[PDB]
């Protein structure tokens, strides 16, 4: 149900709390803006910015694809400069495309007491690692990143199903932690280990 087709759109990467984007329920990392007021956003150009500007204090209708739910939804958003912060929406985006987006996640399984994972605040079963400050586009890439950060702090971005929020954690892999490996938690990857739909 995307008029115009294609998988291009604007990947929402930041949503400031209490912004018009936040009030509309835009979710960082998972949401892709695919149209605004029925205009398909399938090109990297100024259409989105200009339509927001033309509609300051006027509700607009966005069509959004979520890589969390794998569904399209419509959201009403009111661009405004009266909410206290900077920008009409209070979001940051990059032109992108949503096909494959839901696959690059790593499911936190059991977490051992006193492990590097425990210390970082990783939560068994409900946490999903969604990325880091370097590219990870294959199953083994989180494990490679962990290897390359032996005894070094590593920033991970993490979604939690219970709070339904994303956060940043810092983990320091450590092969001398006392138990197996450098992490001390299980990690799942693949169709059984994606964010519950």
């Amino acid at each position: 149900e995307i008029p115009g087709g294609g998988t291009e759109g604007y990947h929402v990467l930041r949503v400031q709390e209490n912004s018009p984007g936040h009030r509309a329920g835009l979710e960082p990392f998972f949401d892709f803006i695919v149209s605004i007021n029925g205009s398909r956003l399938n090109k990297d150009n100024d259409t989105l910015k200009d339509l927001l500007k033309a509609n300051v204090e006027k509700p607009v209708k966005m069509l959004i694809y979520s890589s969390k739910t794998l569904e399209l939804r419509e959201a009403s958003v009111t661009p405004s400069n009266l909410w206290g912060g900077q920008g009409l929406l209070g979001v940051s985006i990059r032109f992108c495309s949503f096909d494959g987006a839901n696959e690059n996640v790593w499911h936190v399984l059991e977490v051992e007491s006193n492990s590097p994972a425990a210390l970082a605040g990783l939560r068994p079963h409900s946490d999903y690692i969604i990325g880091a400050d370097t590219v990870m586009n294959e199953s083994e890439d989180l494990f490679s990143l962990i290897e390359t950060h032996e005894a070094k702090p590593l920033k991970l971005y993490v979604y939690n199903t219970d709070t339904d929020n994303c956060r940043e954690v810092i983990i320091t892999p450590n092969s001398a932690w006392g138990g197996e490996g450098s992490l001390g938690c299980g990690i799942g990857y693949g169709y059984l280990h994606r964010i519950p739909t």
Binding site: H11, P28, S92, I93, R94
Partner: peptide
């Protein structure tokens, strides 16, 4: 643990420049 106003710039498909709107 950081939780606020985070930019999750960790997508390998993103092509365009990072824009604040």
């Amino acid at each position: 643990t950081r939780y606020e106003n985070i930019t999750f710039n960790c997508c390998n498909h993103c092509q365009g420049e990072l824009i604040a709107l």
